[PDB]
Every structure is written in structure tokens, then in C-alpha cells.
Amino acid sequence: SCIQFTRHASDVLLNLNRLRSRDILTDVVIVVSREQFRAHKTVLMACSGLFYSIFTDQLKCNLSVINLDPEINPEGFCILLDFMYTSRLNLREGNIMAVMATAMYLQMEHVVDTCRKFIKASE
Amino acid sequence: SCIQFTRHASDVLLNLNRLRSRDILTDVVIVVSREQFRAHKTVLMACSGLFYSIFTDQLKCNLSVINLDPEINPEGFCILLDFMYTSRLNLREGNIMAVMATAMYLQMEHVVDTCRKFIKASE
């Protein structure tokens, strides 16, 4: 018999992004080919199968720095980190291959699906 | 020119609630009249003007235990903590006064608004 506030989840995510932009309570640095990205471990886990596996590990859950595979493109990661905190994906002809490869590595199934569909339309 | 995934914010919140239910990466205990509630500081800040003020304070941001005012009802807090992680509010005739008072103290404007409206309909 609950009532539901339609905009609550969107408002929560908007506030989490405001905390990220002001670097408030960020607890991890993600290193991608020398580029560094500060974030909240919980948000990373909520969006990515890879981060979920990493931060539920009894040893890795305590790390303040995570280094990604050197094949990962920093721009592709930045676009996906922005998507995690906003639901908006900046998908372009010039970045789609790097975004899809990064989303496959991060295990972000819905992003992988839209990249596959956008690539299939161009062939 | 971004594309947007409609269900992303809801899916993020659902995963944050799954982490709460398994006590994963919870970083604070909220004490309400001897009852204890584990939560994520970022989620509390994203939902409540009071927690936002508390955890942006340079001294309080580092506390692992927060004690609420003794007038706060533990059931009212539990209902609001559930709302924070699900967007669902268990509002009933028997709890509405305690829920409204707790939401006013926590500074959760949309909850206060629906409580005022439900109370006004009953008079």
C-alpha cells in the first residue's frame, strides 16, 4: 500500500553528481592510462558489473586507487563515468568504438546493447 | 546531442538498496532512541537537507555514528530510510504524524508536502 514519488531516483542521481562535481565524499581514484577520475565506490558498483566484483572483494574493497587495463581509453571511460552519474550517454561516430569496448570491459550491458545497435545501423 | 537511458536512475537506486540490504560499503550508523540504522552517507545526503548539512561539515563528515534528536520516532525514521532507497513511502493513518515530523526534521520537502496533503484530506 506504498505511494511512490516518480522523480525521486532522478533527484537522488542528480545530487550524487553534484557531490562528484564538488569532490564530496569521493572514496576512490580510477586510473586510466595516467588520467585520474575521482568517484564514489557505491555509484561505480551500482552501474558496473566490473566495479561490483572489485569492491565486493574482501581485499580490493579497501583500496583507494584502482588501475584499469592499459587498453582502456581515458575518453571512453570519462563518457561512461558521466553516464553513470547522469543517465546521459555522449555517443558519437568518433567515440562509439572506444565507448563500446570500455562498456564491455566495465560490464555495462545496456550501454553495450545501444552501441551494437548504433554500429549495426551504420553498416 | 546525448541519448538517455530512461530506467538508469531507478536501476542505480535499486542496486544501492541491494548494497544496503547486504550491508555492503555502509559507512555510518544512525542512532534513533537506541535503535540503530546502517546506511551510505552519500544516499542520506542525496535525500535529506539535514544529512547534506551534517556530512559537508569538516568535523562531522568523519563520524561513523550520528545520534538523532530524542523526539525522533525510530519507526518514522525506518519508513523514511526505506523511501530514500526505494522512492516508496509506506504512509498510513497510524504513522503519518510521526512520518511528517521526521521528514520536517530531516528536511525532505517532497515527503512533508504529501503528508500535509494527506492530513488536509482527512480533516
Binding site: 506504498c2 505511494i3 511512490q4 514519488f5 516518480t6 | 516508496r88 513511502l89 504529501t114
Partner: peptide
């Protein structure tokens, strides 16, 4: 607010 809605009935979910």
C-alpha cells in the same frame, strides 16, 4: 506521487 503515484500508486505504483
Amino acid at each position: 506521487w503515484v500508486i505504483p
